[PDB]
Design a protein around this ligand. Structure first.
Ligand SMILES: [Zn+2]
Ligand SMILES: [Zn+2]
Ligand SMILES: [Zn+2]
Ligand SMILES: [Zn+2]
Ligand SMILES: [Zn+2]
Lengths: 136, 136, 136, 136, 136
C-alpha cells in the first residue's frame, strides 16, 4: 500500500509514496520523519481536542522538547497513538511530520501556519496564522 | 464515577472528567493538580472557617510555600482533609486546584478572585475581589 | 453572552461585543481595558455613594494612580467589586473603561464629563462638566 | 478458603484471592507481602490502641526498620499477632500490607493516608491525611 | 474542658476553645502562643504588683527579650507561674498571649492598650493607653 504525501514532500516520486493517491495517515516508517511523526501522534493523544493538540504541535515545531510536552499533559493517561495526517492540507504551510522535522532541523524561531491547522484563538509566540490557499 | 470539572478546565473532555455532571469534590488523582488539591484540602482543615482558609489559599496561589502555611496555623491539631471543590463556581476566576496550580506555575504577583470565594473584609496583598459572574 | 459596548467603542463589531444588545456590565475580560475596568470597579466599592466615586474615577482618568486612590479611602473595608457599566450613556463623553483607558494612555490634563456621570457640585481640577447629549 | 484482597491489589484475579469475597484478615502467606504483613501484625500487638499502632505502621511505611519499632514499645510483653486487615478500606490509600510493601520498596519520603486509617491528631512527618472516598 | 478565648482570637471556633464559656486562665498548650503565655505568666510572678508586671508585659510585647525581663527582676526568687488570663477583657486591645505573640511577630514599635490592662501612671515608651470599650 502506498502512502500519500504532500506535493512538496521530499518523499514525492519515491517507492511506496505518491502525491495523488495512497494512505492519508502514516507514521512514515523507513524515514527520519518517522520519529517526528510518532511524537506528533503522541501529542494528538495527550490533548484530545485538536486546537490545543495543534498548539502543542506548533510548540514542538518551534524546538520545544517532546519531554516537556509530556509533562505539560494534565493527566497521566496513555493511550495508543493514531498515525498523523500526511496531507492535512495541500498548501505550502501543511503541518506534516516532514515540515515539522524540517522546522526543528532549521531551529526556526517563527512559523507560518495555515487555517487547516486549527489553533487557539489567542496568540501563540512564534506562530503566525494565515489563510489556507487550498485544502484537502 | 466521573469527576465534574470546570468548563475551562484542561481536564474537560477527558476520560473520568466531565463538565455537566460528576463529583463536585475530588483530590484530582492522576493529575498534577492532585498535589495542589491535597494541599488546599489541608489548608481547609487548618482553618475551619472558610474566610481565613480562603485567605490562606489565596496566599498559597501567590507562591507562598505550604510549609509556612502549616506554620501559621494556631494549633497543631491535624484532622483528615476533605477533598476540595472541583467547581467552586462557573466563572473564569474559580479557585479550583487546577487554577491554583496554574497560578503557582506562572508565579503571578497578583490574582483576581470572584465573590464565590469568600475572603476577609480587609485588604489582602496581591488579591483583587470581583463579583462572580455566574455561580454553581 | 454578548457584552454591550458603546457605539464609539473600539470593541464595536467584534466577536462577543455589540452596540444594540448585550450585557450592560462587564470587566471587559480579554481586552486591555479589563485592567482599567476592574480598577474602576474597586473604586465604586471604596466610595459607596456615586458622586464621590465618580470624582475618584475622574481623578483616575487624569493619571492619578490606583494605589493613591486606595489610600484615600476612609476605611479599610474591602468588599467584592461589581462590574462597571460598559454603556453608562450614549454620548461621546461616556466614562466607560475604554474611555478611561484612552484618557490615561493619552495622559490628558483635562477631561470633559457629561451629566450622566454625576459629580460633586464643587469644582474638580481638570474636569469640565457638560450636558449629556443622549442617555441610556 | 479465599482471601479477600483490594481491587487495586496485585493479587486480584489470582488463585486463592478475590475482590468481592474472602477472608478479610490474612498474613498473606505465599506472597512477599507476607513478611510486611506479619511485621504490621506485630506492630498491632505492640501498641494495643489503633491510633498509635497506625502511627507506627505509617513510620514503618516510611522505611523505618521493624527493629526500631520493637525498641519503641514501652513494654517487653509479646503476645501472638492477629492477621492484619487485607482490605481496611476500598480507596486507593488503603494501608494494606501490599501497599506498605510497595511504599517501602519505593522508599517514599511522604505518604497519603485516608481517614479509615485513624492516626494521632498531631502531625506526623511524611504523612498526609485525606478523607476516605469509600469504606468497607 | 474547653478554654475560653477572645472573640477575635484565632482559636475561636476550634476544638477545645470557645468564646462564650470555658476556662478563663490557660497556658494555651498545643498552640504557639503557649510559649508567649508561659513567658507572660513568669513575668506575673516576677512582679507581684499588677501595674509593673503589666509594664514588663508591654515591654515584652514591644520586642524586648524575656531574658532581659528576668534580669530586671529585683529579686532572684522563682515561684510557680499561674496561667495568664485568656480573656482579660472583651475589646480589640485585650493583652492576651495571642495578641502579644502577634505584636512580637509584627515587631511593632508602638502598641495600644485598654484600661483593663492597668499600667503605671507615668508614660511608657511605645504604649498608648485608651479606655476599654467593653470589659469582662
Ligand atoms: Zn493549508
Ligand atoms: Zn466565581
Ligand atoms: Zn453622557
Ligand atoms: Zn480509605
Ligand atoms: Zn479592654
Amino acid at each position: 500500500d502506498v502512502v500519500r504525501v504532500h506535493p512538496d514532500s521530499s518523499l514525492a516520486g519515491r517507492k511506496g509514496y505518491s502525491t495523488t493517491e495512497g494512505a492519508l495517515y502514516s507514521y512514515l516508517e523507513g524515514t527520519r520523519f518517522h520519529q517526528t511523526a510518532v511524537d506528533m501522534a503522541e501529542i494528538y493523544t495527550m490533548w484530545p481536542k485538536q486546537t490545543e493538540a495543534n498548539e502543542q504541535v506548533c510548540l514542538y515545531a518551534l524546538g520545544e522538547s517532546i519531554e516537556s510536552i509530556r509533562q505539560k499533559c494534565p493527566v497521566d493517561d496513555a493511550d495508543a497513538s493514531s498515525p498523523p495526517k500526511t496531507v492535512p492540507c495541500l498548501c505550502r504551510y501543511a503541518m506534516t511530520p516532514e515540515r515539522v522535522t524540517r522546522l526543528r532541523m532549521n531551529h526556526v524561531t517563527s512559523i507560518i501556519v495555515c487555517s487547516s491547522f486549527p489553533l487557539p484563538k489567542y496568540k501563540i509566540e512564534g506562530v503566525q496564522k494565515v489563510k489556507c490557499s487550498k485544502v484537502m
